[PDB]
Amino acid sequence: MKGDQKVIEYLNRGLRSELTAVSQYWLHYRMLEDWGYKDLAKKWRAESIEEMAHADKFVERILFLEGLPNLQTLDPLRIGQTVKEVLESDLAAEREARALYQEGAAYAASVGDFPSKNLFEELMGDEEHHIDFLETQLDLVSKLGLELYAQHHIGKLDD
Amino acid sequence: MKGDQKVIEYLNRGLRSELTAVSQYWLHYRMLEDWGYKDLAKKWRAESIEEMAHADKFVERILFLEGLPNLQTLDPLRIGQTVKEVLESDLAAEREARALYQEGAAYAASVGDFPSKNLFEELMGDEEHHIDFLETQLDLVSKLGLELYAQHHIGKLDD
Amino acid sequence: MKGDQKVIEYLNRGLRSELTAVSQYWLHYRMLEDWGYKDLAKKWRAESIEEMAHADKFVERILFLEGLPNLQTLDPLRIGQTVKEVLESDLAAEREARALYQEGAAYAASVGDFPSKNLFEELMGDEEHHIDFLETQLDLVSKLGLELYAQHHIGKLDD
Amino acid sequence: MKGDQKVIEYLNRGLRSELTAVSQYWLHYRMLEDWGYKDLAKKWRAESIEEMAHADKFVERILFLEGLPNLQTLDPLRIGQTVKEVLESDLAAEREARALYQEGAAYAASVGDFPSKNLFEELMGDEEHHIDFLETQLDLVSKLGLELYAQHHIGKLDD
Amino acid sequence: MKGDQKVIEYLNRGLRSELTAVSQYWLHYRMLEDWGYKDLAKKWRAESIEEMAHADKFVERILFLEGLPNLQTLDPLRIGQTVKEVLESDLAAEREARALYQEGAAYAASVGDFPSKNLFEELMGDEEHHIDFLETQLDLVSKLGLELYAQHHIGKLDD
Amino acid sequence: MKGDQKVIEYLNRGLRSELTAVSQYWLHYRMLEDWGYKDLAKKWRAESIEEMAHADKFVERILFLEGLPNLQTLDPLRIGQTVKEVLESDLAAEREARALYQEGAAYAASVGDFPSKNLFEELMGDEEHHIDFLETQLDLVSKLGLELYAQHHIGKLDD
Amino acid sequence: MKGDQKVIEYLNRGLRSELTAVSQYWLHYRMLEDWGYKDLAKKWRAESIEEMAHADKFVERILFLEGLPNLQTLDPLRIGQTVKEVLESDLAAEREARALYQEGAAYAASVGDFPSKNLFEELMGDEEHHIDFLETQLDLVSKLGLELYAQHHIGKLDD
Amino acid sequence: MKGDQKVIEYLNRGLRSELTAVSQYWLHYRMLEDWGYKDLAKKWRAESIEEMAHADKFVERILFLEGLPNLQTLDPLRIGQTVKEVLESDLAAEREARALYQEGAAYAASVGDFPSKNLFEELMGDEEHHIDFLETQLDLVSKLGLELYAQHHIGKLDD
Amino acid sequence: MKGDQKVIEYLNRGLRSELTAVSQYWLHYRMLEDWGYKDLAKKWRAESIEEMAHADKFVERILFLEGLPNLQTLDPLRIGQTVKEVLESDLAAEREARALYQEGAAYAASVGDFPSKNLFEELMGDEEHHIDFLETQLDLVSKLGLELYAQHHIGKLDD
Amino acid sequence: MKGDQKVIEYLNRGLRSELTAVSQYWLHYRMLEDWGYKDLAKKWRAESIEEMAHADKFVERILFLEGLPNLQTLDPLRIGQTVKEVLESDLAAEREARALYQEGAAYAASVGDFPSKNLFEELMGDEEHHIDFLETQLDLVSKLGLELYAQHHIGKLDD
Ligand code: HEM
Ligand code: HEM
Ligand code: HEM
Ligand code: HEM
Ligand code: HEM
Ligand code: HEM
Ligand code: HEM
Ligand SMILES: [Fe+3]
Ligand SMILES: [Fe+3]
Ligand SMILES: [Fe+3]
Ligand SMILES: [Fe+3]
Ligand SMILES: [Fe+3]
Ligand SMILES: [Fe+3]
Ligand SMILES: [Fe+3]
Ligand SMILES: [Fe+3]
Ligand SMILES: [Fe+3]
Ligand SMILES: [Fe+3]
Ligand SMILES: [Fe+3]
Ligand SMILES: [Fe+3]
Ligand SMILES: [Fe+3]
Ligand SMILES: [Fe+3]
Ligand SMILES: [Fe+3]
Ligand SMILES: [Fe+3]
Ligand SMILES: [Fe+3]
Ligand SMILES: [Fe+3]
Ligand SMILES: [Fe+3]
Ligand SMILES: [Fe+3]
């Protein structure tokens, strides 16, 4: 069904944002695993897979609206070198994704594309749950120090 | 453990090749679904998820070798506009991936990094199964014509 | 609870649209069955039952807002005489229903009747999934021809 | 138990015929798989395994009659290059095997070796079922054309 | 995918070697059963069926590499007249098969056909397990004499 | 139904042969048990019961053809005094029974009594399996000596 | 089967290296248990038993190649007096074992003993997983300090 | 808890004895397997694992008494070249271990270290069961000859 | 049965020691629970119940030997005021109980009362396991500090 | 293994004592059953079977030490004629067996035969449990009179 070209542009901006988060979370998962924080690694792997579902919802919507989904390029990645910098990198990206979705929902609403608007608002609400998650981990790091925070989430040793 | 710099560069080239295949297969999956070839869409979703696991093997090995995995960029995507061009696009990409892993395995062997060599060889074997699959599909298209080939794989209608 | 009279008018327009789709899909189901395309018949029967649920949601909302639901009349039916004309008739009706729901959601939003607005937007999103379904079947008919498309969905012979 | 030398010669001719069919069917199975007709491939694999059982029954009978089973050589293979030529190659071989078994049963009967006669007649009846199978596939190819026949038996795509 | 001509010749030589082993082991199985060594017959039937799977791996790889698998001929069979000569016949054949796969793996490696190289190496390892088995049996025959060795493996009488 | 008198005479000769084998096998079973070869005893008991089924099939056929089954007399029994002589006695009887059945099948065939012919041929095939069994045991005794052969089949001690 | 003398010497050097690791890991396991780090003791017991299986693979291959496995002596043990020195002791030993297997695989390859080459490569890959594990533990100790690292792994108290 | 230094010296002598038996039994297990006596191989593997448990009990006791367990060195191994020499080698070692444990139990008793005394006496009783086992096998070899003894324990052939 | 009066005196000294440990452990369990270290509390409760079983074994033995078990009085209790002092109090008591049992076992041995001697030696071995437990906890407190040690064993909060 | 001759003499004295108790308990069981005290009969039957296990442990130990177990003769039996005399007869025998085992354990200890010493001490402890049992029954008879004691253990009447 022929979609609004500007809504399609917002959908493709969203897809880009999600692809970036998929890779940034997945890299951070494997970094956390390499550093030995296995419980934090398990959560990051789960967060990356949630973002993969988000990316998929954008590709499907773009195609339904007869647009061309662009998976060629990512936004710039922010790569930590400590557990605190991993948290802060992901938080900064999630804040930019939420702002994008807020913009895309308002735009879609203004042209009557209510199902696209609902997609952006559902994703906005999901990104606020990730922001809440990340802010909470940074608050722990503030109150307890990074060492006590990360030590709690080392996890169990493999068989 | 500090790895050979050149083996790490090959592993990063492989990572890029897999991330490209992941996005290329996923977009093709969703294009095939949008066109109504549900059985070919199932297969492409499965192939993409296989490539996801390959990408993850490269990230893991790069970190073990104290390299920086680079997920920032993809090789250029080849996007088909017909079922036949989807088949041809994926086959071109798999042929380049197979040659890259052949080269990476030979290089890793020449510096005694046998576990990196075995990762490239195992992946080279997997990509050959992909090539076999894609070549077989194109053969069916040559012998039967595209309409007969694609009609067989429309699949079942959703509840 | 006393509702906005204009929202109630949109609800009754929606009910009319749904009653029309229930009957048009059900007739097309039984036509597809009479022509022998049993797999297409099963899907049309399922689509008519989904529309019956839609009709029911409008009757319930109209009554809650102290309106009188009007089930007396249908919009004009479009009846195919070939599988292609069945697809095209249902697509044209679904396009008119989506536009109605878009209008009803915006109107309801403008008077603060948010639960009515949500009803219209949920139904708008459902109608876009039917449009996506129908467009896909027409695309198959375009790429493969009507005979190869319909032959795939003849289905199994009854015991 | 000392057998009739000429019956033993017919048994060894039969063994040769079966070894030839085992290999010809197995090669055709793997050809059909390489071309993508997976449902025809599954049936050819099953037919080759039935012939393996036939070969085994001849080796056992030859030994019981104190002969030397000769598995050194095959009759000439007929290798298709299209699905039609695969069907025709196997049919021609099955016609020669049936004639051999008919001859071996009559001979064995004429010297009173009734259990050998029963072996040849049981195998003759099995070969007529394969001939019936192959003739039927060629009849389909005649009435529908090779493309519609082979397209029906492409089968499902692997996980 | 077009393969190296010389790797394909090695794979066809391997195919011949496996088809020879299949028939040699199967005939030995049935000779051992005819002599009454039922436990040694069970083991030989199992070894033959292992070699069948090896033959099939070679047919599959030759076709993928767009070669013509040749199942027409076998290498010369070695047929024992005692349990000891059966052991010695099979061991001679396995030693020639192991050397052929060693050569094929080294050649495939030298042209970068690593998946064909890994097929020959995996089979070379399997043939070494066969050699180990057969050497062990001949050792028992040296230490205990053939009568004691073969008597242990007569097995149970059939219902 | 009135049968051919000569076929009935062959049926009664067969019945006599079977009664003889029932008793000869049963006596040898109990001899083998008394000497302590319990595994050979179990097999002889099973062989006698198979012959009892054979005897029964002759009594039923004779009656259907309105003959008088004669169970009054046995052929002369051959009673071993060693395990080797038991094997040789049963082999000599089985050779005479096979020749009788061969004669009875040919005769029945020559007068069109095909179901009687089938009975004799089915029994001929059964007797060749017993001959194969006995010949194999004698071959073991030849290659290993009687003591090693019989020792293997002493079996387990009763609770 | 007679093996290459130098490959057998490499396999015996590998056997010594594994027997050393078995005893070193087992003693460390029991020292960690004595100090009260029950979760680190579980992991070390598991690592020792992994090394036991490696030692056994070398004994088996040496005997197949008609060598004499030498279990008489170990390389010098490195015994830690703190959790950190246990980690460092095991990592030094694993780095020497990895280099030995790299050398053994390259030598076995150069004489065409591919199954011995594959045993060294598989073990070289396993030792790299050990190295990864140990390096990760030392990283946690650098980032968190030894007290925080070791406290996390005290584990549960026994019933 | 600070132990008696001489008891600790006996514990470490015991540990040495057990390490020696672990390796000597394990090597003999794999020798028996290479020669084809699989039932004797299974028992030797089980005996080596029992000795591994014995070794572990000494390491634990030494640490509890604040000694340093020494796993660096083994007593000299006795390696058979026939089944009889394997039995005799293990018997000679078990006789020396029993005498050691007898000495260690008496010593521990004389300084009041009753739990160490109980350890040595429990192990002494275990070693007498191994001696009883080995003496019995040598008695069989004496009464029956080595060939009949070893032939009984060849075991079953692997699938 | 009339026992040795001095053995009975040692049994009653033992009973006194056990009653003291029952109460000291139980009080410390409830102290640890009141301070919030629930995992340490669970272990102390379990240790007190083990000591209750020890006390019971002394009452039963005293009665069998026709003595009067004296449960009137306890040795002086040592009550901690910190987790470290709880560990040290229980260790000091366990050291005195082990010395008592060592004395009682030697005495009983010197008058031939072997079952009483076995009781004291079994209990001596049990007390060394408690000493090992307590020493290990003090070692943790030494290496990690009391705060990190006790924090690990706070346990879970009740429903 | 060659044992100490005097220990073997004590073992055979023990065996004699046990054989005597087996028969004395079994006779008393059947006497108690004949008099109608079925619950006392069940316990005596159980006590005789425990003594049978004791006798067996002595025969096994004597043989392991290369002695000749002597089961020819019993110590003199003491046969009651009332329930009180049955109790007193068994008590007197158990007192003599305990004294024997005490002597045998001390002797075995003095020559270092610790496993024999452990056997005598384990049996001494078992005999004290029987003495405790018998003394308790006599105490009941003293406090309640023989009639009230025996009446309680008449038991149930058989179906
Ligand atoms: C960084 C690149 C990526 C990596 C390393 C990656 C990794 C993976 C892995 C390893 C799994 C399987 C998880 C499991 O089975 O436990 C997975 C699942 C999935 N991925 Fe990816 N992925 C990547 C990119 C993508 C992209 C670009 C998309 C779609 C646009 C995608 C969509 C999915 C979906 C939808 C699933 C779940 C499939 C199912 O549950 O059926 N992922 N991902
Ligand atoms: C063309 C006129 C219609 C026809 C031919 C029709 C046919 C049917 C049939 C045969 C079923 C049962 C499906 C089954 O049990 O498999 C059904 C279910 C249903 N219909 Fe209708 N229907 C029609 C109009 C309506 C209308 C006007 C409504 C409400 C406004 C309605 C609401 C429902 C609902 C809600 C169900 C499912 C009931 C349940 O699952 O409990 N249908 N329809
Ligand atoms: C072209 C040469 C052959 C190939 C490629 C081949 C292939 C195989 C394969 C892959 C199987 C196992 C099928 C399964 O497990 O699904 C098999 C089974 C079997 N084959 Fe062969 N085979 C060949 C020649 C032989 C010969 C020469 C004989 C006997 C003369 C034989 C007798 C059997 C029998 C009897 C089975 C079934 C075994 C059972 O079910 O226990 N095959 N064949
Ligand atoms: C030597 C004279 C024979 C002896 C010692 C004998 C012994 C037996 C024994 C002990 C069984 C039962 C086997 C079991 O239950 O495990 C049996 C079964 C049988 N016997 Fe006989 N038999 C003799 C003669 C006959 C004759 C003359 C016939 C018929 C002509 C006969 C027909 C059968 C049949 C048909 C069964 C199996 C019955 C069933 O499975 O329902 N036997 N024989
Ligand atoms: C010759 C050197 C050794 C070899 C070849 C060896 C081999 C093995 C193998 C293959 C297993 C696992 C058995 C199974 O899972 O079936 C094992 C188990 C075991 N080994 Fe070793 N081992 C050796 C030395 C040691 C040493 C030095 C000790 C301790 C001092 C040890 C203690 C154990 C224990 C305690 C188990 C059983 C573990 C469990 O059941 O959880 N072994 N051994
Ligand atoms: C400090 C004085 C004691 C306290 C506070 C105490 C507490 C308890 C508690 C609460 C239980 C039940 C545990 C459960 O069911 O989870 C118990 C079990 C037991 N106690 Fe005591 N106890 C004390 C003294 C004794 C004494 C003096 C003895 C014997 C001399 C004794 C022997 C037992 C035995 C044998 C059990 C387990 C009973 C069974 O499992 O059947 N305790 N104790
Ligand atoms: C007075 C002479 C004896 C009599 C009347 C006797 C009676 C029995 C009875 C009737 C049983 C089976 C109990 C049951 O199945 O409920 C039995 C078991 C047993 N007896 Fe005897 N026995 C006697 C002497 C012996 C001797 C001399 C020994 C060994 C030296 C012996 C060792 C055993 C053993 C070990 C069992 C248990 C077997 C098992 O559980 O597998 N008994 N006794
Ligand atoms: Fe997202
Ligand atoms: Fe997010
Ligand atoms: Fe890949
Ligand atoms: Fe691929
Ligand atoms: Fe609707
Ligand atoms: Fe709709
Ligand atoms: Fe056939
Ligand atoms: Fe056929
Ligand atoms: Fe093979
Ligand atoms: Fe082989
Ligand atoms: Fe018969
Ligand atoms: Fe017969
Ligand atoms: Fe290792
Ligand atoms: Fe390791
Ligand atoms: Fe031991
Ligand atoms: Fe031992
Ligand atoms: Fe205690
Ligand atoms: Fe205690
Ligand atoms: Fe006793
Ligand atoms: Fe007793």
Author numbering:
A (entry chain B), B (entry chain A), C (entry chain B), D (entry chain B), E (entry chain A), F (entry chain B), ...: 1 to 159
Please give me the paper's original passages concerning this structure.
Bacterioferritins also possess 12 heme-b molecules intercalated between the protein subunits, this is the main feature that distinguishes them from eukaryotic ferritins. Here we report the crystal structure of bacterioferritin from Blastochloris viridis (Bv Bfr) up to 1.58 Å resolution. In Bv Bfr the ferroxidase active site consists of highly conserved amino acids: His54 and Glu18 are terminal ligands to iron 1 (Fe1), His130 and Glu94 are terminal ligands to iron 2 (Fe2), and Glu127 and Glu51 are bridging ligands.
In the “as-isolated” structure the ferroxidase center is fully occupied at the Fe1 site and 40% occupied at Fe2. The iron-iron distance is 3.97 Å for the native, “as isolated” protein, 3.81 Å in the Fe-soaked and 3.92 Å in the double soaked structure. A long iron-iron distance such as that observed in native and double soaked Bv Bfr, has been reported when the irons are reduced and not bridged by any electron density. The spectroscopic signature after X-ray data collection is unchanged (red curve), hence our structure of ‘as isolated’ Bfr contains mostly hemes in the reduced state.
